[PDB]
Amino acid sequence: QPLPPGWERRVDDRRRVYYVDHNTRTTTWQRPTMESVRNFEQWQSQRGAMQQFNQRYLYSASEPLPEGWEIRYTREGVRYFVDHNTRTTTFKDPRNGKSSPQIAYERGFRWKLAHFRYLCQSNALPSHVKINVSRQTLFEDSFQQIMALKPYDLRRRLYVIFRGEGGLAREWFFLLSHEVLNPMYCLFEYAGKNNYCLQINPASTINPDHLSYFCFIGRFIAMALFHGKFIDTGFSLPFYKRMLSKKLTIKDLESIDTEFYNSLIWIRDNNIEECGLEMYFSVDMEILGKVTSHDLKLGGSNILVTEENKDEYIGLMTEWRFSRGVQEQTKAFLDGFNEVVPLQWLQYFDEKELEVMLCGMQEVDLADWQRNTVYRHYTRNSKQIIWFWQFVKETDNEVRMRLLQFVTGTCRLPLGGFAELMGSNGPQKFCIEKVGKDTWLPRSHTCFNRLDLPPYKSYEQLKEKLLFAIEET
Length: 473
Hints:
Layout: E1 7-11, E2 17-21, E3 27-28, H1 34-43, H2 50-59, E4 69-73, E5 79-83, E6 88-90, H3 109-122, E7 128-133, H4 138-147, E8 157-162, H5 167-179, E9 188-192, E10 196-200, H6 210-226, H7 237-243, H8 250-256, H9 258-269, E11 282-287, E12 290-295, H10 310-323, H11 327-338, H12 351-359, H13 366-371, E13 374-376, H14 383-394, H15 397-408, E14 422-423, E15 426-427, E16 431-434, E17 443-445, E18 450-453, H16 459-471
Parallel strand pairs: 7-8, 13-16, 16-18
Antiparallel strand pairs: 1-2, 2-3, 4-5, 5-6, 9-10, 11-12, 14-15, 17-18
Helix pairs in contact: 6-11, 7-12, 8-9, 9-10, 15-16
Catalytic activity: S-ubiquitinyl-[E2 ubiquitin-conjugating enzyme]-L-cysteine + [acceptor protein]-L-lysine = [E2 ubiquitin-conjugating enzyme]-L-cysteine + N(6)-ubiquitinyl-[acceptor protein]-L-lysine
GO molecular function: ubiquitin protein ligase activity; ubiquitin-protein transferase activity
Pathway: Protein modification; protein ubiquitination
């Protein structure tokens, strides 16, 4: 097998083959091709705008209790207790009935975030640990240093020393959170055009140490959470749902694999018998050239999909697509995370809260947003679009961010603003389309950054439906 210019084969002490590029000193376990070379070269996108990333930090300028309960305080200092399990509040301590106009129940992201910060603070160890990393070898050096430490050492103060040279911690987290995506390591890939929809790469097995690296990456993301630092890696919301052990759904599927979702949706909503569709309860996978067949259930490759059983086929295909080829990697990541921040500490956050905790949130440029929003079967003077922008103006940045996550599937905004907004198939501006009737709820297609907004009859109805849709799940 011939190799692109600059590259050479090498064999290590255990007779395992790897590859080295004598011009750029990169090494990889997967045989490079010109496709992978051009992929790597574009990925080398200064990996600068760290100062604009740092605005997230200034922006964040704001006996045990039974599970799911919180202590909160009213604006006048009055203690109350929130039961997330029943979505109610009381002034009566559930531990002992001691009582301090019942307070409206509310999700209260900021309260949950503050309790979590206290949880981390309560479990910090004293002193510091020092991480010595060469900036040009940042991934390999951070890996060696973190993995050499007992997980509890990761709960001390972090002193990062960039070889040959507080704010160094933020810079470490930002830079390394980009560095782990380096395709030469083979841990990740993208589902969409450009760098759209990150996911674990089933082919990471070509790296014999891939599970140690996924463990390290879990430890690293947990460390960002514990130390209150923000990362820029761009995990999907279904990935975070997996970290929360939440059920992954067909709607989740739309976010990460348009074609797969579209096929499943067509099978659900069409008579597959009247149109001759011939399908069975097994699926093929190809990793590193090798094809593998997987029965969805016992003997699945022999079971014809019919009108009678196709719902079961659909659920099994959804589950399979979410977990295919990445079970071990995902476990390694979860394990590494859990030994720094117990996953149980996340139990009452949703996936969008988790993403904002990891990524930090910015203030949204309402003018840039509105200047770069496009419409389908609406115009800027439709009553519902005027109501939309009135609702966006009338609310706070938390709701705006939650709406942003609803429509685009993420809280991360592009460096160039809403004109540079990206979808799975390339550039794709925020879009509001007229669908359905005023009795529907809004819906979103995050691959196209598109909000289906029913044509409501009054501002207040638009407000209620919109708030309900962005709060949901």
